[PDB]
Amino acid sequence: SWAQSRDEQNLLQQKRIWESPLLLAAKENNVQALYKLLKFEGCEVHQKGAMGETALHIAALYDNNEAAQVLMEAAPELVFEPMTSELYEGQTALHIAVINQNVNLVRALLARGASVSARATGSVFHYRPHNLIYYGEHPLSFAACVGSEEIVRLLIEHGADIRAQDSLGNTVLHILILQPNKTFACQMYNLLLSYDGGDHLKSLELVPNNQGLTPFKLAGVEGNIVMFQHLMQKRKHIQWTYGPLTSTLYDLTEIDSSGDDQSLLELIVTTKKREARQILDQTPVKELVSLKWKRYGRPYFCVLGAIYVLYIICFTMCCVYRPLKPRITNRTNPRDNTLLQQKLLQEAYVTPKDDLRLVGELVSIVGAVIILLVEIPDIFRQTILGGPFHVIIVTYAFMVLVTMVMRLTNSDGEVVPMSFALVLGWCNVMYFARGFQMLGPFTIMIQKMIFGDLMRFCWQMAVVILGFASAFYIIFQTEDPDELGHFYDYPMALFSTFELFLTIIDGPANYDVDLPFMYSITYAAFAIIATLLMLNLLIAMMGDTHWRVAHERDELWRAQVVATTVMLERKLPRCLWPRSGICGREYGLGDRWFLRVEDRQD
Ligand SMILES: C[C@@H]1NC(=O)N[C@@H]1CCCCCC(=O)O
Ligand SMILES: [Ca+2]
């Protein structure tokens, strides 16, 4: 493995230090022994250790300034020498002195003129999980991360370019946000901005990542609240202060739209980082997504919801009435348990009532491709948060097409693909349960919250039985209802599935008869979903009062509503859903869009 190798190497290095008396005296800070080695013997002062390190690199590790100065006085060319090893390719004796915050050694190394642009591309320095710290590749970046402002100043005085990026395209400002001590990195963040070019052109806070992220945008994705709040200070202007009230104005530039992915909100909803979800609760953002949902967001979800309900309830209205004929085959006693009256008329134009189902069948097709026309071109440019609605809706429209392909071929098994589209269409409309109110001046958790989680179940339950009672009816609409007639007509198919949803009915079972291939599959999935919804509901009934974890269930649901709010903003045209905030083009303050927020203090 790779972990053992460096563990072998770190142990291998200490051996060469123990062997090489120069490296040993450099580690032990033996000034008397060093003068014996370099002056009375002429030992290899260019002695490369096991990590390709010089005696000065060792003296820089263990803060031995006396021994380190002996190596520099007797050999001043060791300063420029970097370590040649693969794990440490690039690190010089300056990076070590900056890491250990040895101000006098750094002052002495800059005195002899050490390169402040020495990039350290060693394998141990890469931004990888096995590496504990990630400080970058330049000695200035090492100084900012250790919090030594005195070293930072000394490096800038020697021309340390603050605009320098590492291999991952991160400037020194990006690296500070990734450090744990965000409380202390805020102070170090301002110190580097003071050395900026002072021009509107080429601002260091505007320099993007290799993945196209500025220090602002990265702080939101990384979930660094203190850096995000700090960065917000220079992104807002206070209009006025009227007693307690303070009407501030937020820039709202790198936090909205006008980009394929140039948008912080799209990054928060798609990240695998759980910490980043706390960003959209901040005081320039929690007002934004709330206004996007309160108007234009909440109504269009119900409009598209009612359309999708009428779409699915029509597809079922055409599924309940399908071609019916007796089995017209003497094969009713061969396999006597057989009891099918299979029916595929496959060409009937009997149109007193079939023209009504003919136009309905075309609605089921033109919408399924429309579902594909709004989902298939979206997969090319996938995270559920967010709901698996998108995954379930595309397979539904895939099933309607298969049922269409199962038609025009008269395949005996057109019940199998038509059944999967029934539950996939309905179970997708329980995804429409999220809505109503997400406002929260007071994040309210009481009896209202238990009642809130119970009504989603009633919505989830009523939807599930509609998708499965219609399914169970189709399966047994063909068979003979004299034996196992739990679903002989639609009102009894619902009442049976309703009863079976609560496990009161024994469940349709008959063993002297052979039942269709679909009943065992559908009822097995029915028992799992029906118990999970009852099991999931039992947690919400208790997970609301035992602790403030109701706020944890609440805040994740808001992120689901916010993730849906960003979903309704991509495919919808521009004539609807106007842009958030107010533009800055006459009145003159643009060319950005600003959000007006006023708060009160007590
Ligand atoms: C101690 C080792 N000896 C040495 O001369 N350089 C190494 C420094 C170790 C730093 C490893 C930083 C990391 O985990 O990436
Ligand atoms: Ca029973």
The dihedrals phi and psi of 253, each to the nearest 5 degrees, come to: -100, -65
Helices (H), 414-516: 415-427, 447-477, 490-501
| Å from CA of 503 to ligand 2 middle | 9
Residue pair 222/276 in contact by the 8 Å Cβ criterion: yes
What tokens does 195 get?
């050395």
Cα separation, 315 vs 550, whole angstroms:
38
Domain ranges of the chain: 1-282, 283-579
Gyration radius from the chain CA atoms = 35
Cα separation, 305 vs 434, whole angstroms:
11
Distances (CA, A) of 140 to 77, 100, 572: 22, 13, 47
Residue pair 157/113 in contact by the 8 Å Cβ criterion: no
Please state the separation of Cα 52 from the chain's center in Å.
41
What tokens does 48 get?
């490369």
Pick the residue whose CA is nearest to atom 15 on ligand 1. 124
Q: Reported resolution in A?
A: 3.3
Please count the other Cβ atoms lying within 10 Å of the Cβ belonging to residue 228. 23
CB neighbours of 507 closer than 8 A, spacing ≥ 6? 500, 523
CB neighbours of 598 closer than 8 A, spacing ≥ 6? 245, 246, 247, 248
The dihedrals phi and psi of 568, each to the nearest 5 degrees, come to: -75, 0
Closest-CA residue to 87 (of 168, 155, 12, 20): 12
Instruction: Report the SS3 class of residue 566.
Output: helix
Looking at all shown ligands, the one closest to residue 17's CA atom is: 1
Closest-CA residue to 140 (of 125, 119, 123): 119
Q: Which atom of ligand 1 is nearest to the CA of 49?
A: 5
For the Cβ of 61 lying below 6 angstroms from any atom of ligand 1, the answer is yes
Cis peptide before 591 (omega within 30 of 0): yes
**430-434, long-range: CB within 8 Å, 24+ apart, which pairs?**
430/459, 430/460, 430/463, 430/464, 431/387, 431/388, 431/389, 431/392, 432/301, 432/302, 432/305, 432/308, 432/309, 433/459, 433/460, 433/463, 434/387, 434/557, 434/560, 434/561, 434/564
Please state the separation of Cα 166 from the chain's center in Å.
25
Instruction: Report the SS3 class of residue 191.
Output: helix
Pairing relation of β-strands 236-242 and 245-250?
antiparallel
DSSP 531: H
CB neighbours of 487 closer than 8 A, spacing ≥ 6? 469, 472, 473, 475, 476, 477, 493, 496, 497, 508
For the Cβ of 27 lying below 6 angstroms from any atom of ligand 1, the answer is no
Residue pair 227/186 in contact by the 8 Å Cβ criterion: yes
Residue pair 500/469 in contact by the 8 Å Cβ criterion: no
Is 506 annotated for ligand binding?
Answer: yes
Closest-CA residue to 162 (of 179, 181, 143, 146): 143
Closest-CA residue to 474 (of 317, 310, 313, 308): 317
Pick the residue whose CA is nearest to atom 10 on ligand 1. 124
CB neighbours of 241 closer than 8 A, spacing ≥ 6? none
CB neighbours of 191 closer than 8 A, spacing ≥ 6? 144, 149, 152
Amino acid at 218: L
Residue pair 37/25 in contact by the 8 Å Cβ criterion: yes
DSSP 203: -
Q: At what angle do helices 517-542 and 490-501 cross, to 10 degrees?
A: 50
Burial class (CB in 10 A: 0-12, 13-18, 19+), 164: middle
| Å from CA of 494 to ligand 2 middle | 19
Residue pair 228/284 in contact by the 8 Å Cβ criterion: no
Ion ligand 2 neighbours (CB, 5 A) are 506
Tokens 């995954």 correspond to 391
The dihedrals phi and psi of 459, each to the nearest 5 degrees, come to: -70, -45
The dihedrals phi and psi of 342, each to the nearest 5 degrees, come to: -55, 145
User: Per residue in 265-292, is it b (16+ CB within 10 Å) or e — as a string?
Assistant: bbbbbbbeeeebbebbbbebbebbbbeb
Closest-CA residue to 518 (of 437, 410, 415): 415
Residue pair 480/488 in contact by the 8 Å Cβ criterion: no
Instruction: Report the SS3 class of residue 40.
Output: coil
Closest-CA residue to 8 (of 84, 85, 72, 69): 85
